[PDB]
Design a protein around this ligand. Structure first.
Ligand SMILES: Cc1ncc(COP(=O)(O)O)c(CN)c1O
Ligand SMILES: Cc1ncc(COP(=O)(O)O)c(CN)c1O
Lengths: 354, 354
């Protein structure tokens, strides 16, 4: 007898779904585990046309984002979060069972999940001790690679990748692979974006999202910025109607000139709060080291991190365990929330210190 | 020199994106080309939690739909329309370059588009003259097939597939392939659903949507109904956060007991309007034949169909040309809208008749 499971693809049977979830509804009161902006920003629907299909690429959203990002509208694609952008790039450039993607741990886990699910080889070149790119390592492992993902600023470590090294990576991949700069957190350090480099690199693509600084993770709205040739290829593999009208409606509102002003205020707010938390953490006994951050989260190494994580977890303070990540033994990632939430973390940590 | 296009997958370079679009903004006043409910049903957001990520599978949506469909919650998956359900099935059961899908033209075009884009062989077995399944043909072309798609009622022809033949198809595929009954239009003939057959067939999957009878195409919300084993496999390949909160919010509202009552009223409305249009069309000179329908659209063969289509198009009456579809020479698909819209069609057609 043949089971339904026997009919599934081998890679699908053996893969482990992305570990995003880690809930405890009505149990935790302080959520600093998903890099979400801490407070809700309200939006209401303005377009009651739900009986009709939306545009594949809502014009107002594309144009408002292009204006905001400083790129041409033809260089923008909107999708269901940066997560879908990751998928589209593999779907368009990586032949299953032939081509591979390359990423550098420790970093965002969806690059690997998407490739493994689609059936594309995952090539890894761990970053250096300070999490900067191992350029020599990458240079000798590019055969068969079609897409390279580099998160900058990096999640979960928090630092920016030296642009001088992005220059090198872009040269190494010229005429060989698409370089994807994941800028999910670039709003917190806008001057470091590679968006203005498009005219120099035909193979450069950039991932953006409304889930973090924009405080709209619930909208599942992201973008890919690239030269027209790349955008048009991605448009050949995207679903016909990837964005719902309610999302196009509210996303456009959030990207209005006033919306941008508000987003920048949110960034300033988070940066000021981040610096408070960083300074405070460094003084806590159970904290061994706090790593520099250019995002809305902080990576810190703790003494008995698993004990600390479980202790805060039971207290309703939900963080993100990084102990199993390469090079991140003893590290926990703390999202920057409100001052009160930072104080909850600080006070709880001071309660450990053995 | 290597171009960006040279880096794209061969199948991606050669494929032709799905032909959904056919717009003429502010030019057409009567839209009967996408099988959308003709009037907007208003919904407002009730959950201002947009800064937080949604659940992968919003509980209220899953439970409300399960209740409505008469199946167990564990037998339901929610996605970005039935379009994504089509994708998930290929993604979970079809190994690119090894396995194939099978469908029977003329039918919905996304089965082929998804398979071709992913890189899975498309096996076709045209339906018979009356668009019923060519069972003998299918029986001899199942080698390597992992997923079979059958739209019932069928788009664009409008008729139901004889359940006696679904029984045969299910036996032919037992322990070999997943049979997917596309029930995007089952709300118009609910008694014909195969949802109650799940306990008898481990390999049966059903596609459902909120885009038609539910009048919520703008929400991009669909479902897949199947036995738990199948649902769980599909859940291994779906994106971590496939549904936005605004959509989960409003979809749940539309699936409330009162929402179901309203949907059924919409169905009754459309059926009554459909019968009016069918009866009227048959009498028009330029109409050669009107085919039976159990949906919210009517397929009809016309004399000089291309002339008729262009004529109405220029008059602001937008239909869906089927002239290029196998066996559908001279046919146009007319969505059932309001009485006024049906009259516009009837009056325009009577203006031809040469
Ligand atoms: C580095 C990184 N990239 C991309 C994403 C996805 O962003 P999205 O909510 O637009 O699908 C995330 C969200 N955790 C992320 O951390
Ligand atoms: C037969 C059929 N199946 C599936 C779909 C997709 O439905 P959705 O708007 O839920 O992605 C459609 C929409 N035209 C359809 O006609």
């Amino acid at each position: 007898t043949v089971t339904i499971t026997d009919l599934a693809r081998e890679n699908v049977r053996n893969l482990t779904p992305y570990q995003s979830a880690r809930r405890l509804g009505g149990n935790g009161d302080v959520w600093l585990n998903a890099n979400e902006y801490p407070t809700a920003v309200e939006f209401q629907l303005t377009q009651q046309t739900l009986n009709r299909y939306p545009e594949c690429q809502p014009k107002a959203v594309i144009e408002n984002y292009a204006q905001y990002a400083g790129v041409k509208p033809e260089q923008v694609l909107v999708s269901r979060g940066a997560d879908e952008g990751i998928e589209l790039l593999i779907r368009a450039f990586c032949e299953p069972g032939k081509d591979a993607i390359l990423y550098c741990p420790p970093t965002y886990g969806m690059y690997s999940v998407s490739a493994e699910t689609i059936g594309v080889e995952c090539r890894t070149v761990p970053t250096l001790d300070n999490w900067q790119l191992d350029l020599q390592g990458i240079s000798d492992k590019l055969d068969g690679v079609k897409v390279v993902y580099v998160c900058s600023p990096n999640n979960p470590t928090g630092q920016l990748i030296n642009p001088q090294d992005f220059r090198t990576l872009l040269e190494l991949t010229r005429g060989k692979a698409i370089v994807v700069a994941d800028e999910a957190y670039i709003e917190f350090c806008p001057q470091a974006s590679l968006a203005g480099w498009l005219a120099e690199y035909p193979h450069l693509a950039i991932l953006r999202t409304l889930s973090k600084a924009f405080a709209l993770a619930g909208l599942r709205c992201g973008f890919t910025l690239a030269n027209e040739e790349v955008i048009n290829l991605l448009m050949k593999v995207i679903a016909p109607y990837p964005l719902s009208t309610p999302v196009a409606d509210i996303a456009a509102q959030a990207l209005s000139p006033q919306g941008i002003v508000a987003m920048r205020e949110r960034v300033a707010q988070i940066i000021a709060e981040r610096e408070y938390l960083i300074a405070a953490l460094k003084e806590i006994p159970c904290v061994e080291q706090v790593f520099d951050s250019e995002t809305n989260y902080i990576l810190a190494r703790f003494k008995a991190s698993s004990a600390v994580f479980k202790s805060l977890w039971d207290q309703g303070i939900i963080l993100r365990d990084q102990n199993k990540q390469p090079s991140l033994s003893g590290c926990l990632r703390i999202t920057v929330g409100t001052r009160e939430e930072s104080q909850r973390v600080i006070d709880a940590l001071r309660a450990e210190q053995v």
